[PDB]
Design a protein around this ligand. Structure first.
Ligand code: CLA
Ligand code: CLA
Ligand code: CLA
Ligand code: CLA
Ligand code: CLA
Ligand code: CLA
Ligand code: CLA
Ligand code: CLA
Ligand SMILES: CC1=C(C#C/C(C)=C/C=C/C(C)=C/C=C/C=C(C)/C=C/C=C(C)/C=C/[C@@]23O[C@]2(C)C[C@@H](O)CC3(C)C)C(C)(C)C[C@H](O)C1
Ligand SMILES: CC1=C(C#C/C(C)=C/C=C/C(C)=C/C=C/C=C(C)/C=C\C=C(C)/C=C/[C@@]23O[C@]2(C)C[C@@H](O)CC3(C)C)C(C)(C)C[C@H](O)C1
Lengths: 169, 69, 165
């Protein structure tokens, strides 16, 4: 459980993965809202795990920081197009319309789709298990914490998170 | 379907590619234009001035087609 | 019944039941009645958007703002586009889902074609037909706008002037 001297709140019964008995404000009260919650958790989780690495790795290679993505000119294109963060966001929203709709829909049709929407079918090595179902959520909770860490560390100090880690090592 | 679709539309589509991509690029290349400094094929579609220099009829656009001229 | 071509018979799946039905579905896109629902949704939406598109293109030019294809040279389109996508993305997700809810029974709840805004209460089948017939005419005119733009390179109203002189 999250806390040794804590008890599991009813609905949380250790059935679904990464259930470390934790819901103080009672937000997963109805078992159907816990469905949304679960899908949102694994979505936020996957995005964070992609965010941390996608914020550090360009920083390390020498491009910039988690911040300073604005005022960057993304460019040399095939016709010598140079565009700004706004145009890049617009691109990102245009190419995210159908992917997100299809993940929110369960499939492609105007009617009922049987399509999971939390753990879809993509495992060509058959590594899906309770261990891995747990490990994805756990790493992603960490990574969410880490991204909140990035934000507030840059908020208080004004330094890049590799420099703040070099001010502790 | 096989006559009108596969062969018919297939010929229309390929005439479309020829008119819009193969004819400019070959016309420029046959006048010794060094392929590195050739325009890319969409450039003939986006900028009608490029294709107008080569074939001026494009400046009249699709109006002749619809008035049977 | 009256049809889109003089002596043409209607397809059997088009029985006049729904508004706009003038017996035109040669490639049988709507033999399955679930696909006919989706297509009806799509036709009304494409329909509405083209009304706003055509009115967005003509009416400013009348009230001295400029030509519709020169619009992005007086605004910062990249910005606006991003805001437009930010207003759409919830709003179109709700329209698709049927309402706010991760459950699939949400799609059965509510109407995704005629959601029920009407405050002056004039929804009939003669008015549902009017939406669709204005819509189809706006779709056809939008294709005319783009085409004329490409061919003539000038204003749409200046293309109407050339008709009479
Ligand atoms: C208030 C003090 C406190 C203490 C002493 C512990 C103690 C522990 N935590 Mg809990 N937990 C707490 C608050 C606390 N927790 C808080 C504030 C959070 C964040 C909301 C958590 C989230 C959390 C997670 C996700 C996990 C623990 C786990 C553990 C155990 C390792 C250990 C007994 C781990 C465990 O389950 O041990 C088996 C574990 O996976 N904790
Ligand atoms: C937005 C991120 C997000 C969301 C939607 C959730 C959602 C959930 N968490 Mg998770 N969690 C997260 C991040 C998130 N978590 C992070 C970063 C940690 C590490 C601190 C955890 C640690 C944690 C533990 C240890 C457990 C959960 C559990 C849950 C479930 C029940 C609690 C609940 O109703 O929360 C809903 C959350 C929100 C509505 C976010 C509101 C946040 C406010 C506004 C700030 C629910 C699926 C329980 C579970 O059973 O897991 C399957 C459980 O035992 N969470
Ligand atoms: C561009 C269009 C677009 C569309 C249509 C969607 C649609 C959706 N998003 Mg997604 N999302 C998008 C872009 C988009 N997103 C982008 C650019 C990001 C950042 C990478 C996200 C990150 C994101 C997260 C973290 C979550 C969603 C969730 C959702 C779902 C619930 C939305 C809601 O309840 O209303 C909002 C009022 C819905 C399927 C949520 C979900 O799946 O709930 C279960 C959810 O938790 N999205
Ligand atoms: C999670 C989502 C995500 C998003 C939205 C981005 C977005 C971006 N990445 Mg990042 N990245 C990510 C995850 C992500 N990355 C991950 C997981 C890694 C580790 C593999 C990286 C490692 C990485 C490197 C090494 C670099 C980027 C770069 C970029 C920028 C490239 C712009 C471009 O070429 O458009 C082109 C235009 C069209 C395609 C049209 C763009 C802002 C580049 C950058 O400019 O960094 C500042 C860059 O050099 N990314
Ligand atoms: C399937 C075949 C095909 C396709 C997909 C196209 C597509 C196009 N034609 Mg081409 N064209 C075609 C066959 C095709 N054409 C044929 C067979 C002829 C000879 C009749 C032409 C003669 C033609 C002219 C003269 C013009 C176009 C133009 C156009 C472009 C813009 C039309 C618009 O309204 O916006 C568009 C890229 C216009 C254009 O913008 O050219 C760059 C233009 O002016 N077309
Ligand atoms: C995207 C636009 C759109 C869509 C989704 C529809 C959809 C529909 N139409 Mg409508 N219609 C449209 C535009 C559209 N129409 C326009 C512009 C006109 C004026 C010409 C009409 C005139 C019309 C009549 C007279 C009738 C219909 C009917 C229908 C319904 C059955 C046919 C069908 O399933 O086609 C599905 C359509 C598509 C999948 C669109 C694909 C179009 C392809 C790409 C070719 C177009 C380009 C080509 C250059 C010309 C269906 C709800 C019938 C009905 O039962 O009404 C209730 C009916 O009788 N329509
Ligand atoms: C269908 C979608 C649609 C879209 C994407 C646009 C987009 C635009 N309109 Mg148009 N407009 C529309 C429908 C649309 N219009 C309709 C249906 C009408 C008739 C009521 C108008 C009447 C209109 C006028 C009179 C003007 C615009 C203008 C604009 C431009 C700037 C508006 C702005 O800054 O926001 C401001 C935010 C709000 C109004 C909210 C922008 C390109 C301006 C422009 O730049 O025209 C060339 C302008 O002066 N619009
Ligand atoms: C209700 C829809 C509508 C209306 C009122 C008009 C009206 C007009 N069109 Mg447009 N047009 C339309 C749809 C429409 N069109 C569509 C759907 C297309 C794509 C095929 C076109 C393609 C088109 C071109 C390429 C041209 C016109 C032109 C014209 C003008 C003269 C007709 C002509 O030269 O022969 C052609 C008639 C049709 C193709 C119909 C007239 C203002 C001409 C113009 O701008 O006058 C200077 C012109 O050059 N139309
Ligand atoms: C569980 C529970 C509770 C709780 C809780 C908790 C702790 C919730 C926490 C929520 C949290 C922390 C959710 C964050 C997600 C982050 C996301 C989506 C990442 C996206 C971001 C991405 C994809 C990153 C993108 C970039 O890196 C890229 C690619 C390049 C960089 O240049 C720029 C940036 C950085 C933009 C209560 C409330 C305490 C009580 C209740 O009862 C039970
Ligand atoms: C029905 C049927 C068939 C069919 C068919 C046919 C004829 C289909 C035709 C469809 C057609 C012709 C559909 C047009 C839509 C146009 C839209 C959405 C317009 C604008 C949309 C917008 C929002 C405009 C935006 C702007 O303008 C604004 C507001 C201001 C400007 O400054 C900038 C821009 C331009 C961005 C078959 C296939 C033959 C057989 C089958 O069996 C049955």
């Amino acid at each position: 459980l999250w806390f040794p001297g804590a008890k599991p709140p009813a609905y949380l019964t250790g059935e679904f993965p990464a259930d470390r008995g934790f819901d103080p404000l009672g937000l997963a009260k109805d078992p159907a809202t816990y469905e949304r919650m679960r899908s949102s958790e694994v979505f936020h989780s996957r995005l964070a795990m992609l965010g941390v690495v996608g914020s550090l790795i360009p920083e390390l290679q020498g491009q910039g920081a988690w911040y300073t993505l604005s005022e960057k000119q993304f460019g040399p294109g095939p016709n010598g197009e140079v565009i700004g963060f706004t145009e890049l966001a617009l691109i990102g929203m245009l190419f995210s319309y159908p992917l997100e709709y299809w993940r929110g829909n369960g499939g492609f049709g105007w009617f009922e789709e049987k399509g999971d929407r939390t753990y879809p079918g993509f495992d060509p090595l058959q590594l899906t298990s309770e261990y891995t179902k747990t490990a994805e959520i756990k790493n992603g909770r960490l990574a969410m914490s880490a991204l909140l860490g990035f934000a507030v560390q840059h908020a208080t100090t004004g330094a890049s998170p590799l420099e703040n880690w070099a001010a502790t090592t | 379907h096989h006559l009108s679709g596969l062969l018919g539309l297939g010929c229309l589509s390929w005439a479309g590619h020829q008119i819009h991509v193969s004819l400019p690029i070959n016309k420029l290349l046959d006048s010794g234009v060094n392929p590195a400094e050739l325009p890319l094929p969409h450039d003939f579609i986006l900028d009608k001035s490029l294709i107008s220099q080569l074939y001026p009829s494009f400046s009249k656009g699709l109006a002749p087609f619809f008035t049977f001229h | 019944r009256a049809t889109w071509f003089p002596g043409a018979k209607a397809p059997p799946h088009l029985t006049g039941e729904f508004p706009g039905d003038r017996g035109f579905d040669p490639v049988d896109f709507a033999a399955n009645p679930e696909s006919f629902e989706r297509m009806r949704a799509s036709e009304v939406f494409h329909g509405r958007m083209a009304m706003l598109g055509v009115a967005g293109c003509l009416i400013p030019e009348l009230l001295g703002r400029g030509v519709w294809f020169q619009a992005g040279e007086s605004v910062d389109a990249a910005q606006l586009g991003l805001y437009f996508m930010f207003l759409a993305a919830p709003s179109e997700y709700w329209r698709g889902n049927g309402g706010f809810g991760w459950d699939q029974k949400e799609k059965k709840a509510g109407n995704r074609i005629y959601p029920g805004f009407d405050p002056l209460k004039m929804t009939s089948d003669e008015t549902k037909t009017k939406e669709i017939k204005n819509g189809r005419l706006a779709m056809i005119a939008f294709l005319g706008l783009v085409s004329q733009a490409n061919t003539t390179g000038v204003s749409p109203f200046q293309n109407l002037a050339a008709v009479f002189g």
